[PDB]
Design an enzyme around this catalytic site. Sequence first.
Site, PDB file in Angstrom:
ATOM      1  CD  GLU A 144      -3.304  -0.739   1.761  1.00 13.14           C
ATOM      2  OE1 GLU A 144      -4.143   0.065   1.204  1.00 13.14           O
ATOM      3  OE2 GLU A 144      -3.486  -1.308   2.876  1.00 13.14           O
ATOM      4  CD  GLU A 181      -3.043  -6.899   2.755  1.00  9.85           C
ATOM      5  OE1 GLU A 181      -1.832  -6.636   2.626  1.00  9.85           O
ATOM      6  OE2 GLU A 181      -3.832  -6.208   3.443  1.00  9.85           O
ATOM      7  CB  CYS A 215      -8.493  -8.073   3.816  1.00  8.96           C
ATOM      8  SG  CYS A 215      -7.985  -8.619   5.453  1.00  8.96           S
ATOM      9  CG  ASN A 245     -10.710 -10.492  -7.661  1.00  8.41           C
ATOM     10  OD1 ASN A 245      -9.518 -10.335  -7.550  1.00  8.41           O
ATOM     11  ND2 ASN A 245     -11.582  -9.709  -7.071  1.00  8.41           N
TER      12      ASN A 245
END
Lengths: 497, 497, 497, 497
Positions: free
Chosen positions: C235, C340, C342, C370
Site C-alpha cells: 500500500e 491481499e 480481506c 475477480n
Amino acid sequence: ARPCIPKSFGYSSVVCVCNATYCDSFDPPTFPALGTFSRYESTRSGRRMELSMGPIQANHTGTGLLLTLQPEQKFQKVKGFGGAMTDAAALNILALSPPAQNLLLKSYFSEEGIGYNIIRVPMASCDFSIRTYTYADTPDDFQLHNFSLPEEDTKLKIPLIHRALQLAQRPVSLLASPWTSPTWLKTNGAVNGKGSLKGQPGDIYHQTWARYFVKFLDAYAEHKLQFWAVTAENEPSAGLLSGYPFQCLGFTPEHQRDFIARDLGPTLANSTHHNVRLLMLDDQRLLLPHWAKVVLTDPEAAKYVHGIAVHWYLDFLAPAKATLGETHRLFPNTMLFASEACVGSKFWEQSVRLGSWDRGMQYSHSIITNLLYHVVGWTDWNLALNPEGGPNWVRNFVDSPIIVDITKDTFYKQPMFYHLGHFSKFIPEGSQRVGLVASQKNDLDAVALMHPDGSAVVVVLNRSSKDVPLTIKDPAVGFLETISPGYSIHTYLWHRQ
Amino acid sequence: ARPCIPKSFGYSSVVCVCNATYCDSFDPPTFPALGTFSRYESTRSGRRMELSMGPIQANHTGTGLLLTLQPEQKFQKVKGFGGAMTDAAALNILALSPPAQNLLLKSYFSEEGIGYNIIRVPMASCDFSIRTYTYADTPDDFQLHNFSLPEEDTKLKIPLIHRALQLAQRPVSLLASPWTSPTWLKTNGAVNGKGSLKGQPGDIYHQTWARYFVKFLDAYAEHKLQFWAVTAENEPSAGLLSGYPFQCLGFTPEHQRDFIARDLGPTLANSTHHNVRLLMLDDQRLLLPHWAKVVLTDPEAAKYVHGIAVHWYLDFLAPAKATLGETHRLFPNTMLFASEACVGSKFWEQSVRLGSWDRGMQYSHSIITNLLYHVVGWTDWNLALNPEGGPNWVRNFVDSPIIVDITKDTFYKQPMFYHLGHFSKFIPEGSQRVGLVASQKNDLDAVALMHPDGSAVVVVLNRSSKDVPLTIKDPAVGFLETISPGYSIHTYLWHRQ
Amino acid sequence: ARPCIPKSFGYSSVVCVCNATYCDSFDPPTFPALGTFSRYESTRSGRRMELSMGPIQANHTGTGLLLTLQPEQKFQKVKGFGGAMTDAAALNILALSPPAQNLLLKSYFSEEGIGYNIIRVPMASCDFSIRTYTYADTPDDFQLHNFSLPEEDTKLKIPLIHRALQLAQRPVSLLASPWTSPTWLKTNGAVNGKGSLKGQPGDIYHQTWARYFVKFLDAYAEHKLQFWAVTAENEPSAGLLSGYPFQCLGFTPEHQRDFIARDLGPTLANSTHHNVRLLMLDDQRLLLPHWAKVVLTDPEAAKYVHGIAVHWYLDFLAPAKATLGETHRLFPNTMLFASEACVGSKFWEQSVRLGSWDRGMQYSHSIITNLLYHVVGWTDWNLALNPEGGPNWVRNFVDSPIIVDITKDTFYKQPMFYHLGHFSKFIPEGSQRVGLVASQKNDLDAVALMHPDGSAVVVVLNRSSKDVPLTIKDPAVGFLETISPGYSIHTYLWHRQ
Amino acid sequence: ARPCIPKSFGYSSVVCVCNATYCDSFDPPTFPALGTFSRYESTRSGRRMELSMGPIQANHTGTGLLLTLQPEQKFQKVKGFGGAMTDAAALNILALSPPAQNLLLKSYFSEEGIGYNIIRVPMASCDFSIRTYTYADTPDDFQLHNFSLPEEDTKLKIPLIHRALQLAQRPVSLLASPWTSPTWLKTNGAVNGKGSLKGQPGDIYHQTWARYFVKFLDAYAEHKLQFWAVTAENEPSAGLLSGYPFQCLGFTPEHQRDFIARDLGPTLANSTHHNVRLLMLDDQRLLLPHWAKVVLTDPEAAKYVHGIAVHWYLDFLAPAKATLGETHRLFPNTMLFASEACVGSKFWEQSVRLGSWDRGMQYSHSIITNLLYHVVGWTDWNLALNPEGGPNWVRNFVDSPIIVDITKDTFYKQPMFYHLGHFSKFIPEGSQRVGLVASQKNDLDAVALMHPDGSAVVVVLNRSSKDVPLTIKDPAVGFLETISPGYSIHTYLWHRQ
Ligand SMILES: *[C@@H]1O[C@H](CO)[C@@H](O)[C@H](O)[C@H]1NC(C)=O
Ligand SMILES: *[C@@H]1O[C@H](CO)[C@@H](O)[C@H](O)[C@H]1NC(C)=O
Ligand SMILES: *[C@@H]1O[C@H](CO)[C@@H](O)[C@H](O)[C@H]1NC(C)=O
Ligand SMILES: *[C@@H]1O[C@H](CO)[C@@H](O)[C@H](O)[C@H]1NC(C)=O
C-alpha cells in the site's frame, strides 16, 4: 466585525473561540467596485476569511497557471448550503447560555455569519439522539391516533429552527429525513438491524408509513414551519444489512420505487402539503447510477421524485464521474443534491479533532467535486457536537464544524466551519455554475459560479505544501493575479458590469 | 393475586414481564396466629416473593446457626423506602398505555405492590433529563419574578406523583434535591463543571438561591403537594471538580455550613414552609465523618439541620463503621438517610443487565449494612429507565428496578425490584430496628425490626451458593426452623402476642 | 479421510475443530469416468466440502436456469492461491504443539488440504508483527553491510515456509512485499505516518533502497528460498496520509514509476535474481486505471513491470468493471493479481467472528468477481490469527480462515477456509478460465474453468436464502441436473473426454 | 542542561517535547553551600524544575505559615521510585529512532533525569500487552518443560532493562508481578474471568505455580537480571469477580495466606533465588488492614512476607489512616510499598490528557500522603504509552507520564512526569522521613525527609489558586523564606552540617 480568537489543541491548525460575549464575524456583505476583485483567505497558519482587495489588470504575459472563465458554459443552478438540526446538535446549542446561543446561530445563519439556507430536520430519532423513539410508538396504531412530537421537537429542534430563520435574511429551506419507522411497521420488530416495511407496497403498512409523513408535516405546520422537501428514507441500503447498529428501515431499489409509486407519491399529492418535494436515495453515491435507473425508468415513480439525494464519508473516495456524472447524463432534469456529509474517524483518529486542517480541506474538496458534477446543494451533518462528538446513544463518533464546551460556556469554530463558509457565504440560491478552463496541469481545485445578478465567484483550494502563482482570466473585465499559498483556500469575487 | 411471568435475557436470573393487562402482584397481606410465621422467598433460580407459612414451636432441633430476636435492644426508627421521579422515569412511565402505567405505579406504591412511601424529586433538571433547564433561566431576576415550572414538572412529574399518592394507603413523604442553580448565580456561568455560587454566604446571590428553594415549594403547593424535606444540594462535592459533566453546584463543607446558617435555614424558617426539613450532604459516605464535623459543630448551622443524606454509588471506598458508624457516635441526634441508593456499576458491564441477581443482591446487602449502621431510610434512584439506561443527556452508566420497553407496551421488573420489596413492603414507617444476635460466625446478612403494632420482621439475604440451615428464636414465642438457600432472600413475619 | 467436527459460537455457522490428533481432511481427489461429475458441497447449515457424484445425461429434464460451458471462449490463466506468512501467523502457528502444527499446514498446503501454492511474505515488520524493525536499522549503511534477518525470519517465517513446501505436491510460488524501509531513508524518520524516500529517484537513498530488495533475496536464497515475485511496496498510497499508523512508505503513482525505472528495475535486472518479477500498485483497486496509466505509459517503467497487484478492501468504493475491467483493456498484457484479500469489515462487528458464513461468502463472491475480471491469482492476508484477530501491534480489525487457541492446543477452520478451498483445491496453476453463459437473469455467482489436462471445473455460489434448481451443460458431454441450496457453495468437476 | 520545549494541547498546562536530537535535562546534581537553600519549582503556567537558590536567615517574625523540621522524629526509610516496563511501554519506546530512545531512558533513569531506582516487570502478559500469553501455555505441563520467555521478554522488556540499568548511577531494584497463571492451572480455564488456582494449597497445581516463579527467575538470571522482590499476585481481589475483563487469578486472603505458607515461601527458600523478597497483597488499600491480619498473624506465612504491596487509583479517594495507618500499627516491621498507581479517565475525561496539571497534582498529592503514612516506595504503572493510552489488548484506558508519538518520532513529558520527578530525583534510596509540623491550618501538602548523608529535603505542593507565603524552620540551620505559588510544586534542599 470582530476577528477570530485562536486556540491550538495541538493539531495542524487553530480553532476560533467564541463565548457568551465574543464571536468572530463579518461586516454586512458588500460588492467590490468595478475594476477590482475581493479575495477571502483562510490558511492553515491561521488566517480566517481575511478580506483583501485587488486590481483587475488588462494585460498578462504567460506562463504560470491561468484559469479562464467561460461565462458562456451554463451548468446547474444552486439550491443552497446548510446542516442538520439533530437532537444532539439542539442539545449542545441549548446547553450554552442564551447570549452564547445567538453568537452560535448567527455564525451559521446571519449574513454577518456564513448565510446557511438549508436545514435538515430528522423525523424522530437518529443516532444523534439520546434515546430511540418514533412519533408513533403505540403498537398497531394504523390510524396514527397516538402520533405526536416529543419534547425533542417541541422544546429543542423546533424553537431553534424559528430562531435560525429569524436571524437569516436568505429564505431557508427545510429538508426532513426519517431513519426508522415505528417498529410495528417493520418485519424485524426493532429500530435497527436488518428489516424493512412489513408486507407489500400498496398495503396497510405502506399506507400507514406514508400517512406518517403527512402527520410529520401536519404537526410541523402548526408550529409555523413548512418544508421544502422530504426524502424517501435515510440510508435505505443500511437497513438491508444484518446487525446494523442505528435506526434504519431497509429498501431495495425496487421496494423504494414501488413505495413512492404506490404510496408516498399519491399520499403526498392528495394532501395539503403537495408542494413539498421528494428526494430519492439519500445514500452513498456508489449506489448510483443503478438506484436512479431502477426508480426513475418507471414513469409511475418518476412523476413524484423531484431529485436524488446523496451522502459521502470524506475520509474515503469515490470516482464521481461514474456516479454523479453518469446519473446526470441519464436524468438531466432530476437534480442531484448532497444531503449529508461528514468526516470520520480514521480509526487512528479520534472523532472530534479540534483545529485539523485536513478535515477542512476534505469538506471544501468534496464540495468542489460535487459542484463540478451537477450537484445543486450541500448539507452538512450535525450543526453542533460536544468534544467527544456527541451525544450519541450508540457511540458512533464523528466531527462537526462547531464544537460546544458546555462547562466553559464556550464554542469552538473548526477549520471545517470555514471551508464550508468559503462557499456558503458567497454562493446564494440561484447561483449558476459556469465553466473554468485551466491552462495546464496543476494541483488546484477550483470552481466558478455566477450570482443571479451576473457577478462572479471562484473558489480555489490548494492542497499542496507549495504556493502556486496564478491568474484568473475573465473576458468581460480582464486578469486577476494572485497566489494560492500551500494549504490555503481562497474565494474571489468581482463585478462584471 | 397473579404470579410472576418470567423472561430470561441470558443473565444469571430472570425478570418479571408485565404488560397492559397482566402484572404480578400481592394480595392484601395477612398475618397468622401466634406460633405461626409467614416467609416470603425469592431466589436466583426464579422464585419471586413466594409466600409460605410454618410453625414457631417450642423445642429446637436446629443444630446449626441460631439467630435470636432481642426486642429489648432498640435502635433507630425507619422513615421508609422509595425512589426518584426524575424526568427520565416520568418519560418512560408515560410512554406506556394508561393501563400499563397503572400497573407500573401499583407495582411500587400500592399495598398490592411494594408499598413505597417516599419519592425523591429533582428541583429542575439533572442528567436524567433530556435537556438542561432550571426554574429561572432569565438572567438578573434576583427576586425571581420569572420563576416558573416547565412541562417536565407541570405535565410529567406532578401528575405522576399525584397518581402514586392516590394508589398508596401509607402516607408518602416527598423529598427534593437541587442539582444546579440558574447559571447566572454561578462562578462559572455553566450548568456543570467547577463552579460555585457567586460571592459569599449572606449576599444577593445566596439569598436568591435560598429563595429559589421557597419559590419551588410555593409552586408545588399550588399543585397541592407538600414536601417532607429538601436537601441542601445534590452532590455538592462534585461541583468542586474541574470538568464535572452533570449538573452540579459546588460547596465545600465550610461553604454549605454558611449557606445553611446565613441563608437557607433562616429563609425556610421565615417562610410558610418552615415545617419542611433540611438534610445536609446528599453525597458519598466517604465524605463522612468530616462533612458532619464541619456543619454540625456550628450551632447556627446545626440548629436548622434535621438529617444527613447519603449516596451509595461509591461506598466500596469506605466501609460503614468509619463513616455512618462514626457519624452516629459523634452526632447521635442527627438522622442518617440514604438519599441515592444506586449502582449500574462495574466498568465492563452494560448499564442495564436484564435479570441480574448480582445487582439485586447488591441493593439488599447494602440495605442490610445500612440498617445495621443507623440509617433511617432509602431512596433508590430512577423509578424507571428505558433499556439503554436512559434517557440521560450525558452518559448512561446505571440500572433501574424497572426497565420500560415502549415499542412493546411492556415493562420488566428486575431482581432489584424484589430485593427492595423484601424490605419496603414489610417495614412500614415507624418500624424500629431491634437486635438480632448470631450464635456463631456466619456468611448470611440478617436484620430484625419491629413494626409499630409490635409484630416482628426479619430479612435474611444469602449471597453464597450453599444452603444454610437456620433457626430464629423469638424468646416470647419459640423457634423457627428453616433454611436459607444459596442465592436467596427471605422475609419472615410473625405476631409476638 | 476424516470429516468435520463442528462447533458453534453463536454465529450463523459452525467452525471445524482441529487439535493435535484429529483434523478434517480429504482423500487424494479422484476423477471419474466420462458421463460422471463430482460435486463438493458446503452449506451454512453444516456441510463442509462433502463429496457426492452423479451423471451427466444426454437429455435435459431441467426447466430452470441453464449454465452452458463454452470451452471455445478462453480468458486468463491462473497463477494460483495462498495467503500471507506474517509474524502474527507464524506465532499463532508455532504456539501449537508440533503434531498440531503439521495438521494446520497440511490443512493449507497438502493435497489432503486445500492445495495452496502461493505464500506472501512481508519484508520485515508490518502491523501483524509484535514490534517494529527493518532488516537494516543501523543508520548510514548505504551499502547495507549491516543488513540481516532477525529471529522473525530465521526462527519462525522461514522454517514454516520450508514445511509448507515439503508438504505441497504442487510447486509453491513465493511473493515478497515491503511495508517500510529503514527509517533513515524516509522524509519523516519514522516507520509510519506520512513520508516517502528522501531525495530523488536516481539518488543514494533510492539506490540503497533498491539494493535492499536484493540483499533480502540474497538472505532468503542462503536459506534456499527463491521468489516468484516481489511487489514495489505494500500500500504505497498509505504513506501519503499524515499519521498513518502502520508501517508505510509513500509513493505517488509518479514517484513509483520513477523508482521502478531508475532504481528497482535496473538493480534487480543487474543482479543474480534478474528472474524475479515485479508487481506494481499492491494497493486498493480504487486507484485503477490511473495508477497503471501513470506507470505503464512510460516504456522505461513498463519494461520491468510484470503485473499489477490489488487489495480487496476498499472494494465497495469501486465496481470491478471500472477498475480491473478498464485496466485490462488498457493494458491487456499485464496480469492482474489479488495480493491481499480481506474481511473483518463492518465497524460494529468484532474482528473475529467464529463460524460466520457471511464472511465466507464475502471471500468466494469476491473470488468469482475477480476471476470474471481477469485476475490471475489470490493471496489472502494472515494464514492464522488468535481469537482477538491479533497479535497486531496497532489494532485488530480483521478475521482469518484459521483461528488458533494456544490455551487449548486447538485451531478452528472458519467458513472462509472452505470458501477459499472451493477454489484453491480444484484450480491448479495453469488452469485457464473459459466462458459460461447464464440462460437467464439469476442470483448465482458462477465461474467455469479448465484444468491443464482439460477437465472441467465449475464453482456456483448461492448468497440467497432460497434453493435454486440448476442445469449445467457441457456441449461435449451432456447435462448436469442439480440444485443450488440457499447459502451454499458448490464445486463441480468432470472429464470432458 | 537544555530546558523544556513547551507544547499546549488545549488543557491546563504544557508538555515538554522531546525528540531524536533534543530533550530537556538537568545538570549533574550539586550540593548547595552551607547557609543556602536550593529550590526546584514546577508550575501550572509552565515552569519545569527551574533551579534557584536562596538564603537561610537566622531570624523570623511569625504570623504566616511556618513548618518546623523535627529532625529527631524518625520514620520510614525509603526504598525508591520507579515505573513498570509493560509490553506496551517496551514497545512504544522501541518504536522511536534509537537516539530518541536514549533520551527517553535517560529522562527516567539517568542522574541528569529524574532518578528512577525501581522497575516493575510483569511476569508474562498483563492488559498492557497486545496478546494474552503465559510462559507455559502447553496444557498440563506440570513439569514446566515447555516454559520459556517469548520475544516480548527477549527483544523488548530485557534489552531495555539492561539499557536503563546502564544509564543509572543508583543501584536499580527489579520487582516482578504475575497477573495470570497458565489457564490449565485455573478453575475457569481462561486468562480472565472469575477463577482461581485449582485444587487446594499443597497440591500439584499450587506447587507448579510456585515452581513457575523460580522458572521466571531462572530465565531472567540467564540474561543477567536479578530480582529485588516479587509480589504474590497482581490484584488478587480481581479474579474473584464474575466477568473481570483482563488477566487475573483470584485469591481470597486465606488462599493467599496458605499459598505463601505451603508453596510459594518454601519453594522460593529451597531455590538459588532465596534472597528475593516477597510482597503480599499487590491490590487496593481498601483491603486493609483485613488482608494483612489474615496473612501475617499466621507465623508460617509471615516468616515469608517481606512487605505488603498496595495499589492506588488516583481519580478516587481512600482514607489511609484507617488503612495504611492501622496496618503499620499492627505490623510495624513489614514495610508498606506502593506497587501501582494510575489516573484513569476521570471517566469523562479521555485516558491521555496531554498537559493536565490536575493529573500531575494527583500523583504528588498521592505520593505525599503515601509518605505520610509509612510507605517506603512508589511505583508508577506504564512508563510510556501512545496518545490513545495504548496499545492495550482490551481497551482499558489510563495515562502515563510519558506519551510517545511514533509518527513524529517525538515524545511528550506530561506534568505527571514532573510531579513524579520532584520526589524521584531528590530522595535517593535510604532517605528517612521525618516530622514537619505546621504553625497553623493551611492547605499545603508537605513532607520532609533526610538524606543518608545527613542533608535535607522537603516537598510542598499547592493545590489552591492562592499563593501561600511561608517559612520553613530547621533548628540546626535557620529559616527559609519563600512562597508557594498556587498550582505549584516545590522541592527544597539544604545541607545541615
Ligand atoms: C470571552 O471572550 C473574550 C475574547 O477572548 C474575552 O476577552 C473574555 O474573557 C471571554 N469571556 C469569558 C466569560 O470568558
Ligand atoms: C400480557 O401478558 C400476558 C401474560 O404473559 C399475556 O397472556 C397477554 O397476551 C399479554 N397482553 C398483550 C397485549 O400482549
Ligand atoms: C481431538 O479431537 C477429537 C475429536 O473432537 C477428539 O476425539 C480428541 O479428544 C481430541 N484430542 C484431545 C487431545 O483433546
Ligand atoms: C527536535 O528538537 C528541537 C526542539 O525544538 C527542534 O529545534 C528540532 O528541529 C527537532 N528535530 C526534528 C527532527 O524535528
